[PDB]
Design a protein around this ligand. Structure first.
Ligand code: AGS
Ligand code: AGS
Ligand code: AGS
Lengths: 621, 152
């Protein structure tokens, strides 16, 4: 009767049908049985990584006993679930806990083996002392109490294997994680338990996707557990959608009910610079109130003539998680991908050969054609200076994230000595900086969709190349802590400045003599950039002037530029040895200097608009 | 239990996932029938723990296969080369050497206190000398991901 106070009844719980169906894993359960039914030392311990199913095996054995598939040596035996936490509850006096545990042990021995104690998280059996969890050591080695335990793989060697007198009384059972084909079956069996809790239906083509998809995207966790979450979340989200309106009709309404209040409390601003903001916000409101009322119409076109989860809700879940977009190109993204070297051309000018290669390994990955285990694209573009090869790697990180500072840049010119490698991989255990991990590593392990940029790579020491050697071609590198980080979704970009003027084989042979063939072989196309012709500078001129104008709008201060000045600047863009950097200095020598002189000398105030005009030699405002 | 509930899927995608479940279910029904029949031959025409049940326990524990080559593995061990050749091509002078060190330990002939065989590949770039190790680690465990690999 002391076993009623400190434990529940697993077999009784399994009798009333309160446990999930256990599928497969025949070998593990048969070994648990043939260990649990020997003369002495008859107590197994399941062992293995967290999530692969180790309480599932004990619950399967309990259901199996209740049914009657077990041998004669185990027919009609009850399994009790010991609870070490509720025993040390009130034991402040000097012997009460030992008294409790002794009563429990005596009561277990008082039966004739009709009880199988099952301790979960048994690594907690070492403490309870303050000579505790130690009075069990005699009864263990004789086979009185049949113990079924299950702890993860690495708290075993941390709490138990330290005590080789106690770990002798345990027989280990290793529980390896299943494969995709087996996880599919486990899900096929468990589906009808979520189909009830959520009032929905789940499609087998979705049960296959929730297991194939969650095997190449979520690598930090193990099997089935990392494949049941997708199904459960998809169902819960679908039920939410069923009750209320669908998504993308809810957020459009939430933000509209906010822009209203914004413009309402903004229109009462007795101000003049705030009138250009109100007249700009008042347009996005009418633009949103357009597609909102279009969605409410397109929803009735379907509601007059999305009721079970498919292989699409799963992808949407594994995309909201982990940030990686793996969807189906829902007709809004494809129209944007189709004109990409057109949205990149607003920031980079020329280099058509290189824009149509960076942009070419994004489509052939969003359409599901690239190798699923290798980086999305790994190519190095190199050429003369000031040509636009560090700008392209920023016009690209802005097309995908809408923020130029959401990417990972490391300036490879500080890696002059080989010992500077530990800066991006961590320091081995037992050294100064170890509870910090790597620096490149920990940056990608948190958001595995960024675009890495190794700037000025040939200035480094030829060992960091050999570190990168396996990043390309496999997308993996492990830090000090032993955590493997995957790169199979990033875009690897390496700039350079080799050759410096050689036509095509003074540079192609200077790359070959600075890098090794095993490093050139992992790369995709080696893009060559080209100098700037006189025509393709008259356009960078416009870009620069637009930039400066946008920078000036902090004072509502514009400026008018005449075509003579616009083609004077571009003709004073000179020296096809320095690219397009001199022009940014010419602009500030000509316009910016005298504008700033006039600006703090009175005689120019906000709201004005200054026209530039080419004096016979210089520019006059 | 799978196939009698998968058939009622109002879809076409799974219609090819059902055209194999039936096949394997039948191909296993055949084997069960054959073996249950052989049981009758043995019952008409064991009762002690022999020497190899201990070996079976040593294999269930510790995962190491130390058994008696039950006549189905010895076919794989002779088709090893032609089964690797389904993933690597050429380099037969290396395939023969990798494979020979596995039968040499299944027959219990290699030295018992030394690795099961340890040798180094070397040659020009992109030839196969890393695909072969992954093809060998898959022929033995049936999952390419289950090898301890460290990048030196
Ligand atoms: N063979 C299986 N059949 C059915 N469901 C399973 C199976 N293996 C695991 N599951 C389910 O997958 C999840 C695994 O959870 P548990 O196995 O209880 O946790 P665990 O494997 O013990 O990991 P720890 O060490 O306890 S944190 C549960 O939802 C189980 O119902
Ligand atoms: N084709 C181009 N289109 C637009 N701006 C360009 C172009 N080429 C250079 N620029 C300008 O030049 C600056 C950036 O030049 P970068 O390409 O970053 O220099 P770089 O090409 O990396 O050469 P190095 O070797 O790194 S100094 C920015 O101010 C850009 O506006
Ligand atoms: N004999 C081969 N049979 C099949 N695929 C091959 C063969 N040789 C190379 N490959 C392909 O080459 C890639 C693997 O090359 P690896 O052999 O791994 O390179 P490597 O041998 O490691 O050389 P390095 O110096 O290490 S880069 C895969 O895409 C394979 O398909």
């Amino acid at each position: 009767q002391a076993l009623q106070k400190y434990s529940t009844d697993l077999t009784a719980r399994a009798r009333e049908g309160k446990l999930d169906p256990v599928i497969g894993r025949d070998n593990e359960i048969r070994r648990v049985v043939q260990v649990l039914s020997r003369r002495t030392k008859n107590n197994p311990v399941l062992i293995g990584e967290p999530g692969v199913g180790k309480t599932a095996i004990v619950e399967g054995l309990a259901q199996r006993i209740v049914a009657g598939d077990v041998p004669e040596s185990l027919r009609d035996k009850t399994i009790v679930a010991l609870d070490l936490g509720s025993m040390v509850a009130g034991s402040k006096y000097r012997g009460e806990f030992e008294e409790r545990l002794k009563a429990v042990l005596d009561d277990i021995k008082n039966s004739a083996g009709q009880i199988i104690t099952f301790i979960d998280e048994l690594h907690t059996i070492v403490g309870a002392g303050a000579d505790a969890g130690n009075m069990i050591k005699p009864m263990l080695a004789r086979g009185e109490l049949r113990l079924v335990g299950a702890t993860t793989l690495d708290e075993y060697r941390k709490h138990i294997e330290k005590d080789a007198a106690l770990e002798r009384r345990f027989q280990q059972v290793y529980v390896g994680e299943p494969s995709v084909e087996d996880t599919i079956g486990i899900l096929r069996g468990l589906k009808d338990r979520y189909e009830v809790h959520h009032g929905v239906r789940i499609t087998d083509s979705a049960l296959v996707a929730a297991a194939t998809l969650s095997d190449r995207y979520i690598t930090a966790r193990f099997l089935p557990d990392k494949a049941i979450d997708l199904v459960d979340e998809a169902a819960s989200r679908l039920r939410m959608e069923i009750d209320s309106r669908p998504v993308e009709i809810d957020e459009v309404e939430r933000l509209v009910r906010r822009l209203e209040i914004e413009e309402m409390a903004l229109s009462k601003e007795e101000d003049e610079a705030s009138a250009e903001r109100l007249a700009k916000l008042r347009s996005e409101l009418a633009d949103q109130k357009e597609k909102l009322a279009e969605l409410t119409t397109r929803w009735q076109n379907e509601k007059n003539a999305k009721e079970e989860v498919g292989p699409d809700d799963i992808a949407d879940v594994v995309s909201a998680w982990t940030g990686i977009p793996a969807g189906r190109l829902l007709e809004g993204e494809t129209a944007k991908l189709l004109r990409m070297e057109d949205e990149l051309g607003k920031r980079v000018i020329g280099q058509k050969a290189a824009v149509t290669a960076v942009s070419d390994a994004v489509r052939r990955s969003r359409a599901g054609v690239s190798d699923p285990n290798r980086p999305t694209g790994a190519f190095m573009f190199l050429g003369p200076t000031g040509v636009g090869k560090t700008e392209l790697a920023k016009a690209l990180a802005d097309f995908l994230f809408d923020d130029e500072r959401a990417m990972v840049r490391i300036d490879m010119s500080e890696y002059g000595e080989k010992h500077t490698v530990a800066r991006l991989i961590g320091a081995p255990p037992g050294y100064v900086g170890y509870e910090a991990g790597g620096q490149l590593t920990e940056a990608v392990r948190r958001r595995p969709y960024t675009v890495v940029l190794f700037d000025e790579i040939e200035k480094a020491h030829p060992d960091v190349f050999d570190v990168l050697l396996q990043v390309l071609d496999e997308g993996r590198l492990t830090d000090g802590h032993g955590r493997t980080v995957d790169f199979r979704n990033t875009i690897l970009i390496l700039t350079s400045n080799l050759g410096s003027g050689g036509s095509a084989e003074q540079v192609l042979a200077a790359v070959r003599a600075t890098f090794k063939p095993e490093f050139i072989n992992r790369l995709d196309d080696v893009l060559i950039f080209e100098g700037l012709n006189p025509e393709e500078l008259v356009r960078i001129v416009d870009i620069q002037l637009a930039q400066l104008g946008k920078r000036l709008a902090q004072r509502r201060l514009q400026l008018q530029v005449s075509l003579p000045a616009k083609r004077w600047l571009a003709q004073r863009g000179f020296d096809p040895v320095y690219g397009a950097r001199p022009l940014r200095r010419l602009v500030q020598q000509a316009i910016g200097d005298q504008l700033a002189k006039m600006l703090l000398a009175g005689q120019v105030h906000d709201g004005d608009t200054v026209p530039v005009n080419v004096s016979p030699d210089a520019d006059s405002l």
